[PDB]
Amino acid sequence: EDFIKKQIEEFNIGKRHLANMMGEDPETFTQEDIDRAIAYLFPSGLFEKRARPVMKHPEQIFPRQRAIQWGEDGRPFHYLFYTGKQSYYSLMHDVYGMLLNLEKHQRWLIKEELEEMLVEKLSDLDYMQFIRLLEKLLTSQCGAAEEEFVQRFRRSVTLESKKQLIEPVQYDEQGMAFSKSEGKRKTAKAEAIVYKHGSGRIKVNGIDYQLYFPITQDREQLMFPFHFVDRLGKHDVTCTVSGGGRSAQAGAIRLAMAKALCSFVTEDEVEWMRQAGLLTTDPRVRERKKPGQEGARRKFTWKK
Amino acid sequence: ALPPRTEKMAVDQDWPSVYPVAAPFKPSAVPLPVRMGYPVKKGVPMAKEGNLELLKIPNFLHLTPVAIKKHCEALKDFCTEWPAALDSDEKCEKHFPIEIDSTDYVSSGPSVRNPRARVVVLRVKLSSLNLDDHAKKKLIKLVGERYCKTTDVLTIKTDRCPLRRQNYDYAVYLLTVLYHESWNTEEWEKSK
Amino acid sequence: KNRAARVRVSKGDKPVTYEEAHAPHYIAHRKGWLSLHTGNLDGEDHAAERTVEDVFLRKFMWGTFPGCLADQLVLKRRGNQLEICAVVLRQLSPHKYYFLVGYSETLLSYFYKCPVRLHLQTVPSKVVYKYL
Amino acid sequence: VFQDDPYLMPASSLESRSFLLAKKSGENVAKFIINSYPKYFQKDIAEPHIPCLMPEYFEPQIKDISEAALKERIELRKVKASVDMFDQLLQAGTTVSLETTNSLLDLLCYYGDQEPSTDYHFQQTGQSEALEEENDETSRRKAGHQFGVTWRAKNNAERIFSLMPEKNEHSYCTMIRGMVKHRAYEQALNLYTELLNNRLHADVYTFNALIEATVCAINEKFEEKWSKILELLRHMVAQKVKPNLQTFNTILKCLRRFHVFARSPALQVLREMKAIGIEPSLATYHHIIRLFDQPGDPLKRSSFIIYDIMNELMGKRFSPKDPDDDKFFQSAMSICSSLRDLELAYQVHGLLKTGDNWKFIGPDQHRNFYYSKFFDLICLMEQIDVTLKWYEDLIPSAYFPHSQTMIHLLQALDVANRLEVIPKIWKDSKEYGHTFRSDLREEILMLMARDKHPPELQVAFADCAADIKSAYESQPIRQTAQDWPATSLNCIAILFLRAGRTQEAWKMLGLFRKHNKIPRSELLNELMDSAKVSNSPSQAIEVVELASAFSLPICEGLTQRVMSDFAINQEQKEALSNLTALTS
Amino acid sequence: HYVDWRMWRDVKRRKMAYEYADERLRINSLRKNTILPKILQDVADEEIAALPRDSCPVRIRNRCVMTSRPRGVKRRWRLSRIVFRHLADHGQLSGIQRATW
Amino acid sequence: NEAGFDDDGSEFHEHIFLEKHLESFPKQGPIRHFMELVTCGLSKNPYLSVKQKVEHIEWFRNYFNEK
Amino acid sequence: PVVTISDEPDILYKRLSVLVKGHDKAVLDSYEYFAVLAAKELGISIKVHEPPRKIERFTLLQSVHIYKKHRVQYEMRTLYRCLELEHLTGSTADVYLEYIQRNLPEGVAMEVTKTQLEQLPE
Amino acid sequence: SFFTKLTADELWKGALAETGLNRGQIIGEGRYGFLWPGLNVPLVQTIAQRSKEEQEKVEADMIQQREEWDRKKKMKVKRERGWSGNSWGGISLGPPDPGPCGETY
Amino acid sequence: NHHTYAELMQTLRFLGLYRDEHQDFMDEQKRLKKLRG
RNA sequence: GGACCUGGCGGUGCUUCAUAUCCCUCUAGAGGAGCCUGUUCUGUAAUCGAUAAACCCCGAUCAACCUCACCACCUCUUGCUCAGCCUAUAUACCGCCAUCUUCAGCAAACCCUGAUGAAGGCUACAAAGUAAGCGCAAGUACCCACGUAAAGACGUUAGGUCAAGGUGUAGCCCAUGAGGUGGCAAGAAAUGGGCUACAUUUUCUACCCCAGAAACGAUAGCCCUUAUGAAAUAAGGGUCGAAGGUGGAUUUAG
Ligand SMILES: C[NH+](C)c1cc(NC(=O)CNC(C)(C)C)c(O)c2c1C[C@H]1C[C@H]3[C@H]([NH+](C)C)C(O)=C(C(N)=O)C(=O)[C@@]3(O)C(O)=C1C2=O
């Protein structure tokens, strides 16, 4: 369209001006530099990133306008025009033919992605039938053109690896080896330092654990990782903690020792201890009171 | 109307010449098709020529890096340099002992009357005053509520007089008369 | 139902802009503020007369630029430069626009005792963001 | 000063002046309403106090008959009110002091027994821009007469001067100056003789008023008035008052009125300035420039002193001293336009760019005349690259060019033979508002259809000529109902035929028919060529019939061409033979 | 030319209290010191009792700057609840968001 | 934050040291003790100027002389 | 370019700290980049710091007459950016502070400038 | 109060109550008649004020234009009767709307 | 103080440099009220 | 009157569910005592508005005077205002909301079916539906994609306010408008919601959780002092040592 053409021309001339505007009279002004420059020129302050200012090419700005399907004589181009879903039905026809000639010879795409690739509105059951057809083709022993067909319809997975991040062991102070870890639970911050040897010695906030933690539940909470990993009387921890209460502080301290003993234990045992549930922050925090209520979720009296 | 200067202008032109002042957008002046706003479902961000939100934006167009560079080529006259007072805090403390706090609070409107902006407070070091032994004992006994133990800093506040310069005068006056009364030996010191 | 600043849907023929199209819960998630004064920030004293001057200026501008301001004004206030930015249509005569520009300029100068700057923007027709 | 909206953009200098006077109108609009209602603006919020934002009070707050009330009314410049309560003071018998009687007669002599004008004077410059090339002498005779107050005999000033007991130098000086300002030259001279009899001293501005009065006296020779000026300056020296820049500039204006015989006196005046040690000003140089430049002088050494002046004057920064420095730049560069000297004009622009001489440019009319003559000279003897560079540098950033400047652009481009810039400057002229300029239209059309061009230039010319025809059609019902020019029609038709807009050429041959304008033979031959391309005997017979209807002497050749080049039916052949018989 | 007679009465209170503000301070200090004899404070008691009962800042009601409404006014803008709602929902007043947290 | 606002060159002693306007009575008196209290309060005032401070002081002087 | 070297030695500002405080993080850090670039080509060590934001929250009724249980809650987002500065001259303080407060942004700006001028005891 | 004044769109919405008239004004007209150069009369550069007879004649012309506008509200429109008045059975709607495929009826 | 506000707008409207639709509405309404009531 | 269409109902059928909403279940309360605070009733010369769910620490993030529109008494006439009115009408309204909503529907413009009625438009191994737009969703804020917020269209209840303000209709201008001074907010009683308890996991003291000692409960009444205020309600102390023995039917919340 002439709209798209003059918009592309305007975008080219504008990005040329914009590079000259900031600092970049050289021809190569890349998109992230364009975004940074417009971010500085117009400081957004809007929570919606689509409500922030934008400088893209009109291909990305404007949507995909579908071309005219017929010429100046009627006579539409595709033979499956009068179905109204020419791309989807042509695809179904092609896959069915490839199954037919394969038989005579012998993660998956989402609906929105298929709609983007076909530039046609699609139904859930139509997409499901397409997926079943491609699954039939995959289960049938197929050749390389079929395989690359399945692979241009298939997309990536972007798998995540979930081994606990092992902090480095810093060989420091005088001659001793340690790890310094952090923990947070219920507005309490606890950063701890464990030295490898010392037969078990705790230094919460400069005093010992029987002094900072008179409660046997808190002392048990401190014990928990060492007793799980069977290295009870072997290490020593010096920790400083801010905020919270007795159990929140105990939990944050415990998370810190677990996330430093991870560095001081083998990888199979730290996967085991992560499965035991010591390397994950407890996201359970205090909720908010609401207007018209009597607490976080507690309400007032008679409503029914 | 007229065909605008947005397409009349070309490349290699001076934006400090185009926008001297902090001004609202003026998209006809701007050679950039800026699109603003949450788009409709099958549409684009709305256009450049009439955007109330682009006029609402604080518009840092008049300050581009070459404008900072050339402008401070102009401003490089209005500055001297420092002596060799060194980055060392103890060195600059030795060279210049006292430290006085006197700030301003800039509003934006019709009047420039922020009364709290006259607050003044002086911090001085006894280890840089160097001349107080039973005078420093008498000094602490005079000003008990200040002079925390960890650092040897004396902090005297003034918010009693309306003008900032006489607040500074109150600070230096209290420093010198506390010093003189600390060195003034009294007759009842021995019966402690 | 919430009826704060939400224009209702009639049947599909109602021209409406970004401002009064968007609802008050998008107040700076999508919209932003029409008046930029530092009075409503945590340490300041004069925000009340800032606000009464804001409503005075908006009603004054609506009354002295009769039937030409497209949608609402941009009232900025930096230092002692008060800036009135307008989105006025293209239907009257430019000598009349300049006449009212100077008139509003020095009237607001002698009323608010500050440099007041009228920055105009002329538009052909009332912009339409969607049809409601 | 103007806004940045394309709709609010002034296209011409007249439109810019209209917008500026509208802005000044609105400014004094609110000045009037705020001074009418000062109670609504008494609440100051700004700190520190701003008296020029505080409204001004024009009503006299002192109501009792008093000298304080007299001083208040003098400061408020209420002439009749001050005169009336001075009469009240005289009736009451209160002795009115010398200084305030002096101030009252100061106001009387300054304003000529009339109130100050309620309108701030910006008028008396509303001459039309279509008469800037003829009859500067009658223009001087009908534009040098500002309708000021003539000094009437037995006015309130003379009444106060006769009534007041102890006359002094200040009162006598004020009366001489007021009489000169209100054109009582002989009365001012008689009062100066009375001053000399009364043994008082006249100051600088009084002496300059006397010089102007002696020069403006009627029926005396330039030799006699020069001797009188010498006598007045000898009296000034004897009274030990030191002359100055305004003194010798009044003298130079007077000898500028005194024309050719005063050139060597002007040189003597400037030499005496440099001998005494007072720096001559831009207005001093203006007065000598406009003296030595007179129409009808065949020598132009009076124009070589301009090169002398600038050899004195390069590289200097100036301060305001004398009101005619804008006239200095305008007059010196009028010399540049008269002499056709590119190097001196460039030296003038360089002196302009040195310092605040861009401030010394002055008013908008002087700026427009300055830059118009500059770009006329640049187009007259510069090369096209620097002319277009000056075009984009000055237009429309500095000024709005005029229709004479446009046709001079066309002449420069025609001499240049760089005709590819024609559509761009045409679009610029249309956006500046020269759409209805028939001289511009005729010039662009004849320079545009003069020669055969490459086809992209031809189709650009087709678009431009179509828009010209659109403007000619879309000028409805004006008193200057300009008939379609035959040359403009022929040029538009030739351009359309060259670009291939043959059907447009045929319908505007219908337009030839309705306006009864004689077409050109080159156009008719191009129409024959287009008929050859289209293979249209009907169109060939049509244009031959038009030629026969206007009885042009090429119709027999057109017919012979048609018979040689087309297969013609017998009735059309009979019609063509009948047309040839009618023309023969 | 006011919002109502109540707001006119209130601005009369504001003005005439502001101008009868100084002497009330002086002898209210003469109240709430304990230095002076009781009868020498009593004579002062009758003179403050004779001071007018519309300048005492106990009658000062912080009504809204925009429309007279006694209760439901936020002091920082002198605005009532729903007029503040009006301005902050049209977004003619900066910095105010809808509190979602 | 202090454009103008000179307060006629008061310079730090007129604001807080009010002996010269105190005009000492018998200093053992309760009137003198009350004057010490008022002098300290006017010294702690940053909003009133020395002119209002003294005028307030001689208002007290006038009333005490009346009684 | 008038200079006027007049008479008296420098007032010696150490740690001019500029607290720039607003409603908009993009305004704050664009101003940060502007001032850091400016002081960078000036030659003065400029440092950055982010004091935590404060949100002033409060509650109003929604209906005009009744319905206290349904309320609208409003908030102010007040966001600090500390631009602390050490080792700069008095005249340089005038010129840098000059240009900074001249190109201060709109109602999304306040700037509290804390000057520690040193001086000698007396 | 000027502050508690409100717009005519809201006023007419509240007055008409349909959810369950200023075009006859030039930009510079007031009853005192302080006619300016920027408004009303074009931009001699002279500020002035008209007389009482001119003011009353101008406002009489404006009012008679107002009752003319009221009359051109309340004319009577002639509807052709279909089978009876206040009916629909013989009412002629116009020719059918032109079809989107270049068709005329 | 509201007097400068309200009376300045009264004056400026009656000058004709201000157009206040609220006052125009009550003017038309009270014209009809004096017409029939 | 006969036969339908659509909707609502059904102490209407089948099937699948709800999970703090439906029951069995889990925890802590109300209803029983005292106090505080609204409301009803009585009373007074003494406002008004809310009043099943969707009223009842509601307009009020709040009444000694003020607020205040109530009453008593006495005064003002171009009355701060080219007046005003808190006069009636929420069944004329705008304005801002409640409720379904702890929903997912509402739908311009078309097309088709029903012999061209009101109406209706479902079968993916597919029988006539296509859809702009609003909403849910999505995107945002807070600490995550979770959760909580916000958001929730058309309409329902003529659902709430002419007393926030504006306002159409009808009325007043010797009044129903304006100002000054002084009073109005008391319980034979009842009820809604909170607070404190009836104690042993309790009470007092130190400590802020390894002791000692008891073996109870008013934030009510009266007195003193203080804070603020012109003029006391609040705070502290003193004094006193109530009723009360974990509360039936029913019910709330998670
Ligand atoms: C008597 N009915 C026919 C009625 C009449 C009007 N208005 C009029 O007809 C009066 N019109 C005039 C005054 C002449 C202009 C009415 O305005 C009303 C009603 C009904 C009421 C009922 C109200 C009631 N409450 C207040 C006790 C109630 O219980 C309900 C309810 N469903 O809960 C109501 O419907 C009710 O609140 C209500 O809204 C009514 C009216 O609005």
Ligand SMILES: [Mg+2]
């Ligand atoms: Mg009939």
Ligand SMILES: [Mg+2]
């Ligand atoms: Mg009711």
Ligand SMILES: [Mg+2]
């Ligand atoms: Mg009443």
Ligand SMILES: [Mg+2]
């Ligand atoms: Mg609700």
Ligand SMILES: [Mg+2]
């Ligand atoms: Mg919600």
Ligand SMILES: [Mg+2]
């Ligand atoms: Mg949502």
Ligand SMILES: [Mg+2]
């Ligand atoms: Mg009802």
